[PDB]
């Protein structure tokens, strides 16, 4: 509704996007308290994923009476127990599920996605091709164009752009790589207000941001066993963190059903964003995400060498 | 259909958009031979429209056995017969249907749409408001921005832009009026090749162009009785003329499900276009079309005085 959209825009610059208390439904999330060893939150769709690891779970309510050792891999639990630095995700795979868990304050946060084993030399070949091509770039402009062409080759997204920020955080589209029959966004300007400060902040917590489907219903976090601290839990280090309905609408209005964005960092400063938009919904596996982030990180070093 | 898309792009500048031998499905079309008063062409969906005029019609095969006096209002036929000028459309309404027919070459062409009687002063109020506001404009910039705001208020479309052509027919977006959560298209350039010559030509035959749903399937014109001339019939004087699948795909990739464009003319030269895009499909009645075209016509006259 128009008035609800207006009210969202009223408080949008201050919206707490790190604590949506909901997730995107392409995975499930558990939140466990470190000291009480108890599940304190579960995403609404937790049943349809964790039934694969423990066949005794049928509804969301069964999780309260479920045992963590039945839901998570033994390796993931022991890795969370001995990991001492905060917000460093541990990635553990089984035959059917793909877990990503980290330690944040007094909690363990576990995301899980479905996973399909893919055995091929394709990633090693793509990695070598990407690096040699980026090493050959000797001019600033040639590098960003090669990077945008490579990101498109790897992910298959319909349009891939690079935003560069100016000192005052306004964005300009400095290079583009798009399929035919698309409006050219090259040299488009957008104001700093379009990306709130806290939205830029997330790229320093997790350098990739993933929206596989702008029209999937966000799943909220249900309380399971009562926590000692009831403040909402920061979800920013993982990938399932739900998207602001505002931005989902913005993406719809542009004809975009799926997006993936990657931060470009010069030292610790955020210099720009690599953004990928797709007209149809689109899922990218964890390995493809890694390949994109590694390619962008390699490109950044060469870029600073060139300037 | 990527490969087929590429082959269509190959021949796009040469594509004959005036003779698509198909129509958009928000109406039905008959093409009748002038001398024999015989239906030589009918759009495939004619049944669901003319069933309202003769309920003994259920499907297209009934039209082959039909006589036009059974399908059309008698005054419309006598008006087409007695008219002496070509391509000047006659507009005839019944309680349930709205016909637009004209005289073209060897035939009488008739479009028919569904129609619902709506009784209110809304149109007179909008008309008065538009004229008084457009009369207050004292500068070129004031006029284009007021016009874009007014066209948006009248049609309710999500985005309304004004393209201005330069001497070599490249387009620049000089003014825009768009809802919140939309990428600003202000000052966007597009090359002359993006609007082929035959498409600009159409605005001189009919100043409004209407696409109420980019995802509706074009309905082809079927031969009924063999005509004396087998050359394709120019459909450009009406509004049902089917849209190039190329442009429909272009609009999808831009997030547009419905579009309406209106030509801005300085004497008979085409000076620009007023374009309306909507994220979801949208239908505009014949009265709304007349109001949009008259408002643009009034704005243009004020513009030439202003410069
Ligand atoms: C007041 C708050 C607003 C807001 C919030 C918001 N935006 C993002 C992410 C965006 N939004 C971008 C906007 C654009 N402007 C343009 O001109 C174009 C052109 C293609 C775009 C895309 C933008 C560039 C980003 C970052 C990268 C991206 O392209 O996705 C977020 C983050 C969403 C999240 O939770 O991940 C928020 C909260 N957007 C506004 O426009 C104003 C209203
Ligand atoms: C080689 C032929 C091509 C083609 C054909 C084509 N275009 C139109 C109508 C258009 N197309 C427009 C394209 C744009 N360029 C931009 O930068 C933007 C930005 C928003 C747009 C929309 C355009 C402005 C018009 C006229 C206005 C409108 O919105 O309709 C047609 C006519 C369609 C019809 O009614 O039959 C045709 C045939 N489009 C191409 O992109 C190239 C491939
Ligand atoms: Cl990940
Ligand atoms: Cl009409």
Numbering used by the authors:
A (entry chain C), B (entry chain A): 6 to 312
Study authors write:
Recently, studies focusing on the naturally-occurring phytochrome-activated diguanylyl cyclase from the bacterium Idiomarina sp. A28L (IsPadC) have suggested that asymmetric structural rearrangements within the phytochrome dimer eventually regulate OM activity (in this case the OM is a diguanylyl cyclase (DGC)). The PSMs of Bphs are bi-stable photoswitches, which reversibly convert between red-absorbing (Pr) and far-red–absorbing (Pfr) parent states, thereby capable of regulating the dynamic range of a variety of OMs. This transition between the PSM states involves a Z/E isomerization of the BV chromophore, as well as large-scale changes of the protein backbone. Therefore, we generated the PAS–GAF truncation (IsPadCPG, residues 1–312) to address the effect of the core chromophore-binding interface on dimer photoactivation.
Upon red light illumination, however, a subpopulation of dimers is formed that features distinct spectral properties compared with the dark-state monomers. The isolation of individual oligomeric species following gel-filtration experiments revealed that the monomer population features a characteristic Pr-state spectrum, whereas the dimer population has a homogeneous UV-visible absorption spectrum resembling a Pfr state even in the absence of the PHY-tongue. Denaturation of the dimeric species (IsPadCPG dimerE/E) also confirmed the homogeneous BV 15E isomer population. The purified IsPadCPG dimerE/E crystallized only under different conditions, and the elucidation of its structure revealed characteristic differences in the interaction interfaces of individual PAS–GAF molecules. For each of the eight molecules in the asymmetric unit, the electron density of the BV cofactor was indicative of the 15E isomer. Even though the resolution of the corresponding structure is limited to 3 Å, the characteristic sliding of the chromophore in its binding pocket and the altered conformation of residues Tyr-168, Phe-195, and His-193 around the BV support the modeling as a 15E isomer. In fact, the whole-BV environment resembles that of the Pfr-state protomer of the IsPadCReg2 crystal structure. Interestingly, also the NTS showed a rearrangement of the α-helix and the architecture of the cofactor linkage, superposing well with the NTS conformation observed in the presence of the PHY-tongue in the Pfr protomer of IsPadCReg2 (9). In analogy to Pfr formation in the full-length context, a switch in cofactor coordination by Cys-17 from β- to α-facial is observed after isomerization of the 15Z to the 15E configuration. One, defined as the nonnative interface, involves the GAF core region normally covered by the PHY-tongue in full-length IsPadC as well as the NTS region, and the second dimer interface (defined as the native interface) involves the GAF three-helix bundles of individual molecules in an identical conformation as observed for longer IsPadC constructs.
